[PDB]
Specification:
2 chains of a larger assembly, 198 residues, mainly alpha, 4 helices, 96% helix, 0% strand, binds 1,2-dioleoyl-SN-glycero-3-phosphocholine, binds ligand 17F, receptor ligand activity (chains A, B), amyloid (chains A, B), phosphoprotein (chains A, B), amyloidosis (chains A, B), high-density lipoprotein particle binding (chains A, B)
């Protein structure tokens, strides 16, 4: 309601801002004119300075690039050749190493896997009997536990009857007057709050 | 009142739970004993068979492992020799490359750096002139910037004071009845808060 009075001061604030938006911004533009003029005194020389330097720079760089490229060509080629022969020697080494070791590894695998074929096979079979006996134990006690659980579930359901019936009715018998009392407190609160929030 | 009866049902449940857990832990343990006894008997054969068989298992594996290690060491010697002799050539030939190609690198680096010296020296010197021009403009423009900024700041301070006092006093003057009316509503609303929760 009184916001009009407060906002009126905001309008005055806008006016004060507009006063600055004029000469201050205009002055800023005048400063910008100095900035642009300055840049036209800096960049004018800078750009030419760059051009007059980039040319010999790229030229000197080209010289260095040439030195590097030529030097690298006279290095990469012979080195690659030597590395190739060295790699071929390494390859031959690898071949002459991985071949006997490969055959050996295959026999190693034979001696290991065939061993496993005669180690894990009876092991799994033994485990099968062991697991079977264990399964029977789990089924014996499990089947009993199922009966026990069913009995306990029955006891639990029976002990739940005294909760889902009398206790639930008791809760309902409590909820009725409670909700009523809550309603009285809520209704009054609603009116009371509305009266002060109007 | 509600909590008293509700919690009563809780204790009337904990008791039943305790009366249930009693035989439950026993029945569970009885079944657990049957299982664990069987597991023990089973584990007796399990561990014994595993240990009795682990002996020839390890013996078989170690036997082959001996061959694996022996043949490995047997071949490791000539293989290491191939690596050593081969590397001797590879490294020696490379050392014979790092020498001339290294000298060439240094010689190329000489021209590389020396050409850089004859370029970077005047480049940085001329850059000093460029930077001088930049700094000159930055100083001259800066002097204006600061002068204008001071002017703009003064203009800002003028409108600032026109708001820090008149507008602020308007706000503060309004804050008086506003805060008071708010206090009136808050203090009165506080009645409901207490008369509804106690
Ligand atoms: C319609 C347009 C109208 C114009 C209205 C503009 C609205 C903003 C209005 C008022 C707030 C300004 C108050 C700031 C006063 C400080 C000025 C100052 O002196 O400042 C520089 C100093 C640091 O200098 P120092 O190292 O020498 O001092 C530290 C000392 N030690 C190193 C030396 C030992 O810093 C400090 O005081 C730190 C101050 C903390 C900054 C508070 C700013 C609060 C305002 C807005 C929040 C902005 C969030 C940003 C969102 C992005 C928007 C684009
Ligand atoms: C001698 C002179 C010296 C230099 C002086 C300054 C001059 C100004 C120029 C460059 C420097 C400013 C850089 C600011 C970024 C620019 C963004 C921008 O303006 O972009 C747009 C451009 C153009 O695209 P277009 O389609 O319009 O033009 C079509 C192509 N037309 C032009 C070629 C024919 O886009 C591009 O140039 C594409 C680039 C996007 C790159 C993507 C991949 C980034 C990967 C890795 C970076 C991280 C490295 C980190 C590792 C180091 C850790 C220490
Ligand atoms: C010392 C001097 C020499 C140094 C060597 C020069 C280094 C540079 C050379 C090669 C770079 C290799 C790295 C690339 C990585 C990606 C591998 C990849 O893409 O992997 C996934 C594929 C998927 O299968 P696919 O059916 O789609 O591909 C069929 C392959 N296709 C189409 C080619 C027939 O799998 C494959 O390519 C299967 C890969 C299995 C490779 C088996 C042969 C291994 C040979 C020798 C053993 C060496 C022992 C010595 C080690 C010592 C080193 C110091
Ligand atoms: C101690 C006495 C208790 C014995 C049972 C009596 C009532 C169960 C009471 C309490 C259990 C605790 C809460 C379990 C949560 C289930 C809520 C429900 O209602 O979930 C229905 C939705 C249906 O969704 P759907 O149609 O897409 O899936 C159909 C399923 N299909 C694709 C997967 C195979 O399923 C789901 O959320 C996923 C779960 C579906 C599980 C169904 C297993 C029913 C097993 C036995 C019922 C027969 C009891 C009779 C035995 C004689 C007793 C004297
Ligand atoms: C029909 C509806 C029935 C619902 C289903 C049954 C759920 C079981 C529910 C309730 C149990 C019976 C109620 C007994 C009530 C009182 C228990 C008690 O006296 O409470 C207090 C204790 C100790 O007080 P505090 O240390 O907390 O306080 C620190 C002390 N102060 C506060 C001074 C700083 O609290 C403790 O002992 C906290 C327990 C310790 C954490 C045990 C973690 C168990 C994990 C998994 C369960 C599976 C076990 C089987 C797996 C075994 C494999 C070998
Ligand atoms: C007939 C049928 C045959 C089957 C029979 C075999 C089944 C039983 C299985 C295994 C044999 C159990 C061994 C007997 C019990 C003793 C357990 C124990 O205590 O033995 C002691 C070891 C050593 O102790 P230490 O190393 O400290 O001492 C070494 C420190 N020295 C350097 C300082 C001196 O302890 C250990 O072996 C404990 C290591 C286990 C915990 C590893 C932690 C893994 C953590 C993270 C993995 C990431 C999961 C994330 C998801 C990724 C999935 C891919
Ligand atoms: C314009 C172009 C001109 C062309 C002309 C060429 C001639 C110039 C010649 C050589 C300059 C290349 C220098 C390479 C970088 C050396 C880094 C370094 O100082 O290294 C040795 C140090 C000493 O060890 P420290 O533990 O005592 O020192 C660390 C402990 N503190 C800090 C406490 C003292 O650190 C180590 O050895 C630790 C290992 C980490 C360093 C790995 C070396 C990485 C090399 C190059 C990176 C760039 C690859 C890209 C280039 C490829 C282009 C195709
Ligand atoms: C588009 C792509 C192409 C662009 C081309 C750009 C053209 C520029 C071309 C070539 C570079 C010329 C300019 C740089 C050469 C100046 C060398 C110099 O005179 O350096 C002086 C320094 C300081 O003197 P000090 O040795 O007594 O103090 C060291 C004291 N302490 C240990 C505490 C760190 O010496 C040191 O740092 C040396 C001792 C410490 C070792 C540092 C590692 C050096 C190796 C590799 C890293 C390279 C850094 C060079 C990057 C330059 C960027 C401009
Ligand atoms: C029947 C229906 C049932 C109703 C029941 C439910 C209601 C919830 C109940 C209670 C919650 C509030 C209780 C806490 C009372 C303390 C309030 C207070 O005075 O707390 C101030 C503290 C800050 O410490 P200090 O001032 O004492 O120490 C100053 C430093 N020394 C120590 C050197 C002096 O606060 C802090 O730590 C944290 C907050 C910091 C805030 C500072 C003020 C910022 C101002 C404006 C920004 C906007 C705030 C608006 C929030 C949005 C709301 C939607
Ligand atoms: C973290 C490390 C990252 C580096 C990883 C390197 C390993 C690479 C893996 C395998 C070898 C690959 C070897 C590849 C050699 C081929 C180099 C070449 O000519 O590449 C052509 C490309 C072409 O790019 P374009 O953008 O023109 O084309 C793409 C096209 N539009 C599209 O949509 O697909 O340009 C490029 O990719 C970029 C320019 C490269 C210039 C060459 C520059 C080479 C410079 C120097 C030589 C190398 C150093 C040797 C040192 C030994 C001597 C002392
Ligand atoms: C209608 C009338 C309006 C006029 C009202 C006038 C009332 C003025 C009264 C009080 C204003 C208080 C103005 C305080 C200004 C700064 C005051 C200041 O420097 O305080 C110093 C403290 C000290 O910090 P330290 O870290 O040094 O130590 C902590 C200290 N020991 C402790 O226990 O707290 O730091 C603090 O606690 C600072 C937290 C300040 C909280 C504000 C934090 C900023 C909160 C909000 C601003 C965000 C605005 C977002 C708007 C954008 C979208 C619209």
């Amino acid at each position: 309601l009184k916001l009009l009075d407060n906002w009126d001061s905001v309008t005055s604030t806008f006016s004060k801002l507009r006063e600055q938006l004029g000469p201050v911004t205009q002055e800023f533009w005048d400063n910008l004119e100095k900035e642009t003029e300055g840049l036209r005194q800096e960049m004018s020389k800078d750009l030419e300075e760059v051009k007059a330097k980039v040319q010999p720079y790229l030229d000197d760089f080209q010289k260095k690039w040439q030195e590097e490229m030529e030097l690298y060509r006279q290095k990469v080629e012979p080195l690659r050749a030597e590395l190739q022969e060295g790699a071929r020697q390494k390859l031959h080494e690898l071949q002459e190493k991985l071949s006997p070791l490969g055959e050996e590894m295959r026999d190693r695998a034979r001696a290991h896997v065939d061993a496993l074929r005669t180690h894990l096979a009876p092991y799994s079979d033994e485990l099968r009997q062991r697991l079977a006996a264990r399964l029977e134990a789990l089924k014996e006690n499990g089947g009993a536990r199922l009966a026990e659980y069913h009995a306990k579930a029955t006891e639990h359901l029976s002990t739940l009857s005294e909760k889902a019936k009398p206790a639930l009715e008791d809760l309902r018998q409590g909820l009725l007057p409670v909700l009523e009392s809550f309603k009285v407190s809520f209704l009054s609160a609603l009116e009371e709050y509305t009266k002060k929030l109007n």
